[PDB]
Amino acid sequence: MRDLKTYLSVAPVASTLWFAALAGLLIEINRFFPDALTFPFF
Amino acid sequence: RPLWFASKQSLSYLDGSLPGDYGFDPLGLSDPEGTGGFIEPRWLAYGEVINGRFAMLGAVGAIAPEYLGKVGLIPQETALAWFQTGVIPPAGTYNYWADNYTLFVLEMALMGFAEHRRFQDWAKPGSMGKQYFLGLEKGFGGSGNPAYPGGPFFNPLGFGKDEKSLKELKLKEVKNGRLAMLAILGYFIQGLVTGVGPYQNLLDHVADPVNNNVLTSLKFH
Amino acid sequence: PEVKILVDRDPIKTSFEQWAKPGHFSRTIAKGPDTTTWIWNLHADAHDFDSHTSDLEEISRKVFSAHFGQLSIIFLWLSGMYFHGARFSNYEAWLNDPTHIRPSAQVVWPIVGQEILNGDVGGGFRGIQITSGFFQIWRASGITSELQLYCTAIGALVFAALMLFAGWFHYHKAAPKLVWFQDVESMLNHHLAGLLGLGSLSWAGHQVHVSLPINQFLNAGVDPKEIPLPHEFILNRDLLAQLYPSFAEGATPFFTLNWSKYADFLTFRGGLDPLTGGLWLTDIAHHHLAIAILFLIAGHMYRTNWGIGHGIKDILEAHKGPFTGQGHKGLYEILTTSWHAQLSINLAMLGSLTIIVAHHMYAMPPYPYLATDYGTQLSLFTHHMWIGGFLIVGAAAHAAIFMVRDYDPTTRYNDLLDRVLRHRDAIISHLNWVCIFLGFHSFGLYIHNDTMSALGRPQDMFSDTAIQLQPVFAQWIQNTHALAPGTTAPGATTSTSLTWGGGDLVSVGGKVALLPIPLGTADFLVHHIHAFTIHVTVLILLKGVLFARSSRLIPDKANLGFRFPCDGPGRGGTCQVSAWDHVFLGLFWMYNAISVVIFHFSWKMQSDVWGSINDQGVVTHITGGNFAQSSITINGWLRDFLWAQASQVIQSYGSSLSAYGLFFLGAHFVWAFSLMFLFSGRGYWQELIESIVWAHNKLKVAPATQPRALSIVQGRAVGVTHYLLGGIATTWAFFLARIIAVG
Amino acid sequence: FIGSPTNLIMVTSTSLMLFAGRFGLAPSANRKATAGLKLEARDSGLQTGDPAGFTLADTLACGVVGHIIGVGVVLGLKNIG
Amino acid sequence: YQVVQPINGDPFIGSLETPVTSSPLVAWYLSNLPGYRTAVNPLLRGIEVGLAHGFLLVGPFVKAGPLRNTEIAGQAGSLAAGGLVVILSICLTIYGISSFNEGDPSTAPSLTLTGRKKQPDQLQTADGWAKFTGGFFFGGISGVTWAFFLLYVLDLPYF
Numbered sequence A: 001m002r003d004l005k006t007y008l009s010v011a012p013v014a015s016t017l018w019f020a021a022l023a024g025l026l027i028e029i030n031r032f033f034p035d036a037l038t039f040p041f042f
Numbered sequence B: 001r002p003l004w005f006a007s008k009q010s011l012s013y014l015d016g017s018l019p020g021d022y023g024f025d026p027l028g029l030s031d032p033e034g035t036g037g038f039i040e041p042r043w044l045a046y047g048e049v050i051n052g053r054f055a056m057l058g059a060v061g062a063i064a065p066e067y068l069g070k071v072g073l074i075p076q077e078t079a080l081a082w083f084q085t086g087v088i089p090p091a092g093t094y095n096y097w098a099d100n101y102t103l104f105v106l107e108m109a110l111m112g113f114a115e116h117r118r119f120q121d122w123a124k125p126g127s128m129g130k131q132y133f134l135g136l137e138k139g140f141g142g143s144g145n146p147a148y149p150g151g152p153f154f155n156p157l158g159f160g161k162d163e164k165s166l167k168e169l170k171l172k173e174v175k176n177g178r179l180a181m182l183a184i185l186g187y188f189i190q191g192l193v194t195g196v197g198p199y200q201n202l203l204d205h206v207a208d209p210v211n212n213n214v215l216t217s218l219k220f221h
Numbered sequence C: 001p002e003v004k005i006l007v008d009r010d011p012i013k014t015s016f017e018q019w020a021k022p023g024h025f026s027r028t029i030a031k032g033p034d035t036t037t038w039i040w041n042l043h044a045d046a047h048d049f050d051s052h053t054s055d056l057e058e059i060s061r062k063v064f065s066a067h068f069g070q071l072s073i074i075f076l077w078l079s080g081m082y083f084h085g086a087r088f089s090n091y092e093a094w095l096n097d098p099t100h101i102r103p104s105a106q107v108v109w110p111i112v113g114q115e116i117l118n119g120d121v122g123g124g125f126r127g128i129q130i131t132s133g134f135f136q137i138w139r140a141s142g143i144t145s146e147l148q149l150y151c152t153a154i155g156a157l158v159f160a161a162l163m164l165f166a167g168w169f170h171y172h173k174a175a176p177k178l179v180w181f182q183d184v185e186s187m188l189n190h191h192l193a194g195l196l197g198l199g200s201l202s203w204a205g206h207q208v209h210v211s212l213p214i215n216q217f218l219n220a221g222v223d224p225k226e227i228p229l230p231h232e233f234i235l236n237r238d239l240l241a242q243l244y245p246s247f248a249e250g251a252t253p254f255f256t257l258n259w260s261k262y263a264d265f266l267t268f269r270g271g272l273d274p275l276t277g278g279l280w281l282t283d284i285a286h287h288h289l290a291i292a293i294l295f296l297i298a299g300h301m302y303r304t305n306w307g308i309g310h311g312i313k314d315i316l317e318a319h320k321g322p323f324t325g326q327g328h329k330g331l332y333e334i335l336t337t338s339w340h341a342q343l344s345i346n347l348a349m350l351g352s353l354t355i356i357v358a359h360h361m362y363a364m365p366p367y368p369y370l371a372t373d374y375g376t377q378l379s380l381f382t383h384h385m386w387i388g389g390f391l392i393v394g395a396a397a398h399a400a401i402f403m404v405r406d407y408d409p410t411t412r413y414n415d416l417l418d419r420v421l422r423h424r425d426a427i428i429s430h431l432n433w434v435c436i437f438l439g440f441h442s443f444g445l446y447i448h449n450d451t452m453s454a455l456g457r458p459q460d461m462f463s464d465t466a467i468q469l470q471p472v473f474a475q476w477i478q479n480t481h482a483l484a485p486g487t488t489a490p491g492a493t494t495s496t497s498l499t500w501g502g503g504d505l506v507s508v509g510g511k512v513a514l515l516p517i518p519l520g521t522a523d524f525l526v527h528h529i530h531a532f533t534i535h536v537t538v539l540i541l542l543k544g545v546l547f548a549r550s551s552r553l554i555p556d557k558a559n560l561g562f563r564f565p566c567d568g569p570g571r572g573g574t575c576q577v578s579a580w581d582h583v584f585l586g587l588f589w590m591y592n593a594i595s596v597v598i599f600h601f602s603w604k605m606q607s608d609v610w611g612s613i614n615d616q617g618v619v620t621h622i623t624g625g626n627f628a629q630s631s632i633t634i635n636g637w638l639r640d641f642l643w644a645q646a647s648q649v650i651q652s653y654g655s656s657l658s659a660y661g662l663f664f665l666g667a668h669f670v671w672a673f674s675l676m677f678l679f680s681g682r683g684y685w686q687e688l689i690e691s692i693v694w695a696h697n698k699l700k701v702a703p704a705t706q707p708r709a710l711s712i713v714q715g716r717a718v719g720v721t722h723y724l725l726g727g728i729a730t731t732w733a734f735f736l737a738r739i740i741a742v743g
Numbered sequence D: 001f002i003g004s005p006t007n008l009i010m011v012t013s014t015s016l017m018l019f020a021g022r023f024g025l026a027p028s029a030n031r032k033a034t035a036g037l038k039l040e041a042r043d044s045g046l047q048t049g050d051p052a053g054f055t056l057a058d059t060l061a062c063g064v065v066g067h068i069i070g071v072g073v074v075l076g077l078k079n080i081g
Numbered sequence E: 001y002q003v004v005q006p007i008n009g010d011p012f013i014g015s016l017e018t019p020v021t022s023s024p025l026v027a028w029y030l031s032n033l034p035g036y037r038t039a040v041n042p043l044l045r046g047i048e049v050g051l052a053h054g055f056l057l058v059g060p061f062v063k064a065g066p067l068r069n070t071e072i073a074g075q076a077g078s079l080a081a082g083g084l085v086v087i088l089s090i091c092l093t094i095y096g097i098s099s100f101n102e103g104d105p106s107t108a109p110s111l112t113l114t115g116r117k118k119q120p121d122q123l124q125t126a127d128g129w130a131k132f133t134g135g136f137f138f139g140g141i142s143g144v145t146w147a148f149f150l151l152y153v154l155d156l157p158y159f
């Protein structure tokens, strides 16, 4: 548990989880505001 | 004490402390040399006894209904072969008070508590007579030997109060267990390649032996 | 002396202690890291069990459970394939009409416009056309619904779970000991008779009851949903008696020895099914039956526990003669104490086997509707060729590792190994000469043809019309094969393939399954090119193995270990003088050889076999026999093969084959990228990282794990792996895009 | 079909094979093979009842190989006449 | 019994003794060649060698040449052989010039295979080599002419 928490924070696993979260975020963002070549709000 | 197809390696670990010890181990499986998971000799003895007991039960039970299916008030809907009971649906089913799946899960809930308690006694012997179980724990103590727990439940009639009694009785038990085990194997293969049912099939064999094992050589189904 | 199960209880307790600690096996790693090089080492020596310790028992226990883990991975992959065929496929539509619907078992999500990859594969379905040939396997096994595929996927999932659990169990709870592994007699007895004998007998049992009747029904034209379920064919037997009358006697023929009464479904026809374009299933069943009998007898050769059998030591040490001294005496002791010897033998044999499989599968298509599925055929051949080549190179790698680490004449002396080590120089010199001669007289012919053609002198060219180099031996052999059925294989009706000859073209759905393949001068030239490339890669690998311990250059090469950068720029320069470096080259030359082989196959097939048949029997091939006249000069390969065939992939953009164009370009990129690692050295890079580190330190952002440039060996490893990835991937994209567009 | 057709050929083959095996005339479970010329005497460990050292491994082995030679002879003869 | 032995029984000289390297007939044959005729004047050995090599060079040049189909195939290919043999002589003369000097003795070994003295082979001197290459060239042009005379000039039934 403590050691599982440690292993889940080793560099490869920390980075894969981080990048999976980032990928999910970007994917959803472009799923809501697709085909965006500019910033049209202000 | 007489010996069958013994081995010098096999004889070493099979000297006679166990019932039915005939020194027959042509593949040398109860070797106390390589004891690990599920190959330890005590566990193999326990397994032989338990398989023999369940096989005696199932071997008088599988042949029963289709015997008195011929004698007595017992109807014919209650008179199936052992394979038509719903155990193998593609070979015949029945409509009991339940579904045959709830039947199974209820069966295995009951068998679950009985088997788990029995194992809890095998592993740490004498542990079931400690925790509360609606009373009834003083009877689940055990006797040090797993295959022979004894007590007020598993031995109410008190057979074998001296120990040669228990010796020859254990010998008879394991012998009848081996008999019932190979009887059940015969049931299985015979009900497959002849597909008749053992009791009725036995009656056809006793008509006259024209119908030999080779005759159903041809694997009707 | 006798053989038994011998185990140890709970050798290592399952725990999360060592997961928290990175490189626990290596003492130096366990402590922690000072620089960036430590991270690379952690991965490079993860599975080198024989250096984490010296105990053979521990090495072998680790090996056993790692094999279990690998089996679990394979099962998960299989279950994924079956589930995708069950859920995201058009397998039933394809089953209704095989030669119009394109198989595809993968769809994509519409996220960034990538749904264009969901192309029209027909059947009211839009997905990515697959080349795995899985539909053909499932059809040949008798699978008609997707319920069966679902059940298969779930069964393989629980099998993967079982394999993973067994891996945990046999390492942390009940781990065998050394005398159990070192028993190879019983192990061979069980793998020959039990794994291959019972396995193939069981498969023949499947085909006799499931695939034969169901495929009979499918080829009779029955709607796939109107076919009886397979278990019916077991319950009701007259269902089989209708298709196959001699299922009526029912196994009494098997014991009367009236085996001829089984001639219905146990045939020896040979050739192809004119309806499906595959081998006769009644032939494949008979084949597996005979295979089973053979393996079941063969797994009874070695003695285990009952006196009868063969002691492998006796067989080995019985073989010796006047040229080899005491040969084979001492090999049994070598092949049972070193895992690397076994690994290299098995790798060589498995690579050989994979390539034989590729050839035989292209020549005698075993699955229905496989031959006329050109994409599947091309992909299967190419994939198996690559796998075989890689395995064969690994064989050499591990032979060298053995020679460096485990070879010891003080305690384990063998005579043959010693003699070969003693005349390695003669061996390598003659192999060198053969490589040179073969390279001059195969590629030199191509250069001569190119200049003869460029100087407007085609009569002087080595071609079918100017100076013929006819492969008379191959022509003679294949004519002997064509005449075989009836003359010298009386029980066969058709020759074993249709590439032998006899006419008898077979087509399916207006496409050519097979026809006799002609061998001309271009075949001679390219076969000698093949011989040349194979000989050169053999030279590199054998030179690496034979000179792994010592040479006339550096006299103590074994003390430097199996893998190392160099021993300084002394004696003129000793760059890559190690055995590992020889494997690095062999991979380059293996790439060259396999690339030429698959190019030859693809061009020859698109030029002389594949194509479309028509009403008169006029066969228009993909390229009108342009291989016989254009493949004899390098300009022909560059123009008629690469430039011509390459147009399909370039025009892929804007369609559903766009991903292949993208992968074409990306593979070009990564291949070119490898050259940065393959042409440079780590000194320049260390000196550049120095100033980058300065830039970081100036802003208090320098890392504590000091960044080092990669090792010399790692740089070569990065360079060779990227090179192979790039080249193989660009060939993959080109082949797939071309054969899916023109096929 | 018993003692008339191929039953006699199968019997003579198997019968003769294990008749050899029990006696000398053939490699044993207790008899090792030198070069197919001479046979040494050894104890395989497993207990026998038979006076000549005929164990169950031996009966099964020579029974199997007699069956196979019987199968071969039967199929060949019925294939050419 | 073993067939492969170390050279002359010396196991520390870098070679071995095998059938191809040292079996009776193959030794007799190799010894009976002009190159290994040590006690013979180098000019005659060069003659024999040059005549054999010259004759050989005519065979492939003519048949595999670019004028094989033309009627001057024989004249052309034979002339090409003459050009090649002359080039070989140039390679031989410059080799002898670079590697030898008159005032120096023969670099050939003095010992035989049994350990007896023997006169060092004179072919390895300066003018020994010069006599040999002169004989070789004379023999080579003579061989080409002889082979070139046989066919074309005379019908004489071949192939």
Ligand code: CLA
Binding pocket: A027, C072, C073, C076, C106, C107, C108, C109, C110, C111, C112, C114, C117, C128, C164, C658, C659, C662, C663
């Ligand atoms: C901005 C660019 C962009 C973006 C954001 C995306 C985004 C996406 N693409 Mg896409 N793509 C792009 C460009 C892009 N693509 C381009 C340019 C191409 C042309 C080459 C493609 C071609 C393409 C294809 C062909 C596909 C996608 C797919 C996908 C989707 C999922 C990919 C996936 O799930 O992987 C794979 C996910 C898995 C395999 C799930 C597995 C989960 C983990 C790995 C399980 C591991 C645990 C396991 C149990 C370990 C085993 C241990 C064992 C021993 C127990 C995703 C939304 C896929 C899709 O649409 O899904 C249907 C898909 O098929 N893309």
Ligand code: CLA
Binding pocket: C064, C067, C068, C069, C071, C180, C186, C187, C190, C191, C193, C194, C195
């Ligand atoms: C009939 C007996 C039998 C069978 C069928 C097998 C089968 C197999 N062995 Mg095995 N083995 C046996 C006896 C047998 N062995 C004996 C007697 C010994 C020496 C004592 C060994 C020692 C051995 C070693 C050291 C290794 C194998 C390996 C393998 C696998 C090879 C990889 C492969 O081909 O994948 C084919 C895949 C399949 C056939 C899928 C089906 C898998 C089935 C369920 C396997 C079940 C057979 C198994 C013996 C059951 C007994 C265990 C039981 C108590 C549960 C394979 C599954 C390799 C391995 O372990 O891989 C992990 C390997 O490393 N075997």
Ligand code: CLA
Binding pocket: C043, C044, C045, C046, C047, C048, C049, C347, C390, C391, C392, C393, C394, C395, C397, C401, C563, C580, C583, C587, C721
């Ligand atoms: C049954 C097959 C088999 C097995 C069991 C082994 C086992 C072993 N090999 Mg080996 N080898 C094999 C086949 C095999 N090999 C083949 C076919 C080749 C030819 C290429 C080699 C060549 C080879 C070399 C040169 C070396 C080994 C070494 C080793 C040992 C350590 C491996 C290691 O941990 O490195 C770690 C594993 C990795 C770092 C994985 C690297 C990732 C690869 C390169 C990328 C693959 C790309 C992927 C397929 C697609 C791209 C994905 C990406 C885009 C996301 C180990 C005992 C090493 C050794 O020192 O022996 C003692 C050694 O140097 N092998």
Ligand SMILES: CC1=C[C@H](O)CC(C)(C)[C@H]1/C=C/C(C)=C/C=C/C(C)=C/C=C/C=C(C)/C=C/C=C(C)/C=C/C1=C(C)C[C@H](O)CC1(C)C
Binding pocket: B024, B025, B026, B027, B028, B029, B051, B052, B054, B055, B057, B058, B059, B061, B062, B081, B082, B083, B085, B087, B181, B182, B184, B185
């Ligand atoms: C000894 C040895 C050793 C060596 O070394 C080797 C060898 C030889 C191999 C060995 C072995 C042998 C043998 C033979 C064995 C066997 C066993 C068995 C048979 C078991 C069973 C066993 C058996 C068993 C348990 C069984 C049981 C049964 C039962 C319960 C039944 C039940 C039932 C009934 C009632 C009726 C219904 O309706 C149905 C059912 C539900 C079904």
Ligand SMILES: [Ca+2]
Binding pocket: B028, B029, B030, B031, B032, B033, B034, B035, B039, C004, C005
């Ligand atoms: Ca044991």
